[PDB]
Design a protein around this ligand. Structure first.
Ligand SMILES: Nc1ncnc2c1ncn2[C@@H]1O[C@H](COP(=O)(O)OP(=O)(O)O)[C@@H](O)[C@H]1O
Ligand SMILES: [Zn+2]
Lengths: 508, 105, 210, 110, 105
């Protein structure tokens, strides 16, 4: 079942080969959990970076479902996402237009500054079922003023995108979603199906776009053959003062029906009522402490309202962090609904979504929830995310984590998983074992007192001497009578006294 | 705010009027009137009555629409029933415009 | 939660009579030292060290205005009406946050032993005790829910941390049972159980030790 | 803003409260006040400033009381004019500080 | 200064926390000042040690079939050198010793 061969035979000639291509793309099954699963999955398998920004040579293997990249500032987490997004731009361009051009590496900024060979390579390998196990793509750029230029290799991306485009043109198919949500998400004609690819790899997920769109959908979906509708419009026109509003509504419905009838197979789309409902469900499922979202016009202005932690409030009452996250999910859901019209649940469509700094502007409380439901709402998306948050990491399995070593001078070959299991672990342990951060701030003197106290006890055969007593009193005075620190000190005293008593009994 | 009473003095001696403020204010009035349920019930009652007369006149094609509107009316009545000053304001202005501007009915 | 021993009644409750008098009238500094004798400077329900503290009506003054100036009904609870932030356990939550409850299905710590109903896990949850059914289960469940003994993160945290501090010492004592004669080892455990009356969350520390 | 304006210019005006956004919607008195007290050594233990704004059509106006801030800023300005002194720094860094960098940079106008 | 407003957004004073923060452990500040669990409550694995303890206490401190299964799950998930497994081991040791004492009595 080689897809490229089937497609080549289709292009040269015919119905059988077309059907084979279409079945390869569209066939799937519903699993035990009731979730639709494509027979032929699409995901990024491997990424290699050569003399790109800080990286001399880096190789990353990605998970099919979720990969989280972690490290200090300036380790190149954003650089990795940028590299992937540029590669994905070639698929998007060619789904939209034959021979469309994707984006390219910068000759000013993207070449490593001390690269002896003055060029950079971003090599990606994609997977599309057993029929197409390897789709390699390479973006290349030579430094400014180099005599010899290095060419990018994008033909496999174009070939695959061509299959999607051509098959869709003849008969509507579901299409993959590609989106990037960078840190800039926080900054302050009729709708066509392929608007889903507009600003998908930069510019996606702005709150204002959502609110406007949502109110628009509400106004349209407030309040059926064309011939029957034409007859109803004609009957209502003959009657026409009180029925004039109804006539205008019916004329609109007729125009919409004609438009849908006139509209092409390649741009087939679900009703506005359905679109609205799916997005509402996505928001309520994913966004923590939002249980409901709706549009009010009772006050005389259009207000989006939400039920937040059991209280009905205006969406402007949400924090900026909670708004930005709501915008991200809404935007994603919107694209998925447009690109997956043939699925019972359009959010079970395929795609690759990149999110930079997922915890951006989030209080710790909602950091503990954000990832729980993302994978449940979008089961066939490959998520590639970056974070600094131990709270986020406490909700994710170690297999999904890729960490930069703290001593990495940009020479290292692989990113690997942490040694410790993060999912369900305590915050302090993640900080120490995964993020290399001490539980107490090293730059504060008082941070060392309990440690020093313990050492003093051990040095004086467990007896509380003048020096240990002074420090004990300092701990008590600074942290307080019911402080954890003092309780630990008390515990140490008690255990050391018991150990000494045992030692005396043994000596006698 | 366009609904605030002293907004009536905003740019009143600037020379142009504020026709934009009128349109905003008028849409505001409309939304409030539509959102008032009893007027909506009265309007719905009137629509149901008009549609019932059409069905009684031999137009069997609009029976489906009548049933839908009767359902909507019943639902509106079922929802907690309580004249909007906003409704009167709207009517006054509409009449003024139509009376003074000859081409506008 | 501890078994409390209510022993002597203060003079001022004789003077004030229910119906005529209001709780705003009565002087509170007369009442406290008898409670502080009973409760040891610790909260009735959670076993905080009391520092922001109020007098609580176990059966409230709204539902039971007859049971108002009654020495049985009064307890010293953690929390404060005055200071900013809605307090989220004990006295204050019973009224505001817990909502609907039958006061018959709550452990009263002066009357009853809580230990037969409640179990304190060393992981820092309080749970119903091993093998309860019917009413005995329903009291355990509703006491936990209404006083918010697990759901207050500040309380859940503090108790968990207090116990986890002593679990090296518990581990170590029960190794030495091997070597010593009974009366010396029984003295050791008696001594440790003596100390924890001075400590916060004394019930939870008991269950860890015993 | 009232200190900065008056250090720069005699009679300089700082910023004002908005009638639309700064007044609480359900305020019975229909005005808003922002009151600050500054300290400047034991010789000037209290420098009070109030920024005020009333709703349109209220019977009385609520005006800002800025004179102490202006008087202090005038000392800094006038003394500096005669003989250079050190001056205070005032700055606000919002979440807006996270913005992209224009690599292309302007010639020294001076 | 802690800013906990009411449902209307209004507050009268801002309070300092009761706990000293300077030089304290981050996990304590999370729980005592920010009001967030140090372990994610929405993750099942976060409750396994608690459940394990309860099973051990239900079977008079002896590892039964059910407690052994969960022990193995903890070992498999968190690993042989995990703090969680050490705590489980500790629980076993302590409870076995307590039960032995109870039998002697
Ligand atoms: N062309 C380049 N040559 C060398 N180092 C570069 C180049 N471009 C960026 N860097 C380095 O890459 C790092 C920035 O990577 P970035 O992905 O933005 O970091 P983060 O992991 O914080 O998102 C910095 O250490 C910067 O100095
Ligand atoms: Zn309490």
């Amino acid at each position: 079942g080689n897809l490229l061969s089937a497609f080549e035979l289709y292009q040269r000639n015919v119905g059988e080969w077309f059907e084979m291509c279409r079945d390869y793309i569209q066939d799937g099954h519903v699993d035990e959990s009731g979730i639709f699963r494509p027979d032929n999955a699409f995901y990024l398998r491997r990424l290699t970076l050569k003399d790109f920004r800080r990286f001399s040579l880096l190789e990353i293997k990605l998970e099919e479902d979720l990969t989280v990249i972690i490290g200090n500032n300036g380790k190149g987490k954003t650089s990795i996402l940028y590299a992937i997004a540029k590669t994905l731009s070639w698929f998007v361009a060619n789904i939209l237009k034959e021979g469309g051009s994707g984006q390219r590496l910068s000759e000013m900024t993207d070449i490593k500054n001390d690269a002896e060979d003055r060029y950079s390579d971003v090599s990606s390998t994609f997977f599309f079922g057993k029929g197409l196990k390897s789709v390699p793509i390479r973006l290349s750029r030579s430094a400014l003023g180099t005599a010899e230029r290095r060419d990018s290799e994008v033909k496999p991306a174009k070939d695959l995108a061509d299959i999607w485009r051509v098959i869709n043109e003849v008969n509507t198919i579901n299409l993959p979603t590609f989106a990037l949500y960078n840190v800039e998400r926080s900054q302050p004609r009729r709708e066509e199906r392929f608007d889903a690819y507009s600003q998908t790899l930069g510019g996606a997920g702005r709150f204002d776009h959502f609110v406007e769109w949502y109110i628009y959908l509400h106004k349209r979906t407030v309040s059926s053959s064309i011939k029957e509708l034409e007859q109803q419009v004609n009957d209502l026109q003959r009657t026409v003062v009180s029925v004039k509003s109804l006539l205008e509504q019916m004329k609109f419905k007729l125009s919409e029906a004609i438009e849908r009838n006139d509209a092409a197979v390649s741009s087939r789309v679900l009703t506005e009522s359905v679109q609205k409902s799916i997005v509402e469900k996505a928001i309520c499922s994913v966004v923590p402490s939002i249980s409901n979202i709706w549009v009010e016009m009772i006050t005389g202005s259009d207000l989006v309202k939400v039920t937040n932690d059991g209280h009905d409030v205006t969406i402007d009452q949400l924090s900026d962090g909670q708004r930005v996250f709501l915008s991200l999910v809404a935007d994603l859901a919107r694209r998925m609904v447009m690109l997956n019209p043939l699925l019972e649940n359009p959010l079970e469509g395929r795609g690759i979504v990149l999110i930079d700094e997922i915890e951006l502007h989030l209080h710790p409380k909602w950091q503990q929830e954000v990832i729980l439901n993302l994978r449940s709402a979008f089961p066939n998306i490959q998520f590639i995310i970056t974070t600094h948050s131990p709270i986020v990491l406490s909700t994710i399995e170690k297999r999904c984590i890729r960490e930069f070593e703290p001593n990495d001078d940009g020479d290292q070959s692989f990113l690997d998983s942490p040694d410790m299991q993060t999912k369900g672990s305590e915050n302090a342990q993640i900080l120490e074992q995964v993020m290399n951060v001490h539980s107490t701030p090293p730059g504060i003197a008082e941070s060392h007192w309990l440690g020093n106290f313990e050492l003093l006890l051990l040095d004086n055969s467990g007896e509380l001497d003048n020096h240990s007593q002074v420090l004990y009193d300092q701990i008590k005075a600074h942290f307080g009578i019911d402080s954890i620190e003092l309780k630990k000190a008390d515990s140490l005293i008690r255990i050391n006294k018991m150990k000494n008593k045992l030692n005396k009994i043994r000596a006698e | 705010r366009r609904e605030e009473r002293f907004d009536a003095y905003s740019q009143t001696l600037g020379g142009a009027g504020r026709f934009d403020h009128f349109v905003e204010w008028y849409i505001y009035l409309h939304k409030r009137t539509v959102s008032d349920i009893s007027s909506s019930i009265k309007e719905l009652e009137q629509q149901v009555n008009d549609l019932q007369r059409t069905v009684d006149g031999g137009m069997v094609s609009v029976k489906s629409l009548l049933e839908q509107m009767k359902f909507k009316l019943s639902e509106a009545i079922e929802r907690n029933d309580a004249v909007l000053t906003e409704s009167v304001q709207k009517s006054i202005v509409e009449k003024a415009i139509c009376s003074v501007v000859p081409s506008i009915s | 939660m501890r078994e409390l021993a209510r022993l002597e009644r203060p003079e001022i409750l004789d003077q004030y009579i229910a119906g005529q008098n209001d709780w705003m009238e009565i002087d509170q500094s007369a009442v406290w030292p008898k409670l502080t004798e009973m409760q040891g400077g610790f909260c009735a329900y959670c076993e905080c060290r009391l520092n922001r503290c109020h007098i609580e009506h176990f059966r409230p003054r709204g539902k039971f205005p007859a049971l108002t100036f009654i020495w049985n009904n009064l307890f010293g609870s953690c929390g404060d009406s005055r200071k900013s932030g809605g307090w989220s356990r004990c006295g204050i939550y019973k009224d505001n946050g817990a909502g609907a409850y039958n006061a018959d299905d709550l452990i009263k710590p002066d009357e009853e032993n809580p230990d037969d109903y409640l179990l304190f896990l060393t992981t820092g949850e309080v749970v119903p005790a091993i093998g309860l059914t019917g009413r005995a289960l329903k009291k355990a469940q509703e006491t936990i829910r209404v006083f918010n003994l697990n759901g207050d993160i500040k309380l859940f945290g503090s108790r968990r941390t207090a116990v986890q501090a002593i679990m090296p010492n518990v581990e170590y004592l029960y190794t030495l049972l091997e070597e010593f004669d009974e009366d010396d080892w029984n003295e050791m455990l008696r001594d440790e159980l003596e100390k924890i009356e001075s400590d916060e969350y004394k019930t939870a520390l008991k269950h860890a030790w015993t | 803003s009232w200190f900065v304006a008056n250090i720069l210019k005699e009679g300089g005006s700082g910023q004002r409260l908005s009638e639309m956004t700064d007044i609480k919607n359900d305020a019975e008195d229909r005005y808003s006040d922002v009151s600050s007290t500054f300290f400047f050594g034991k010789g000037l233990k209290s420098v009070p400033i109030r920024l005020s704004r009333s709703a349109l059509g209220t019977a009385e106006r609520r005006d800002s009381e800025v004179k102490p801030a202006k008087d202090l800023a005038d000392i800094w300005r006038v003394i500096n004019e005669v003989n250079t002194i050190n001056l205070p720094t005032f700055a606000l860094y919002n979440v807006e500080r996270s913005q992209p960098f224009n690599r292309n940079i302007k010639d020294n106008t001076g």
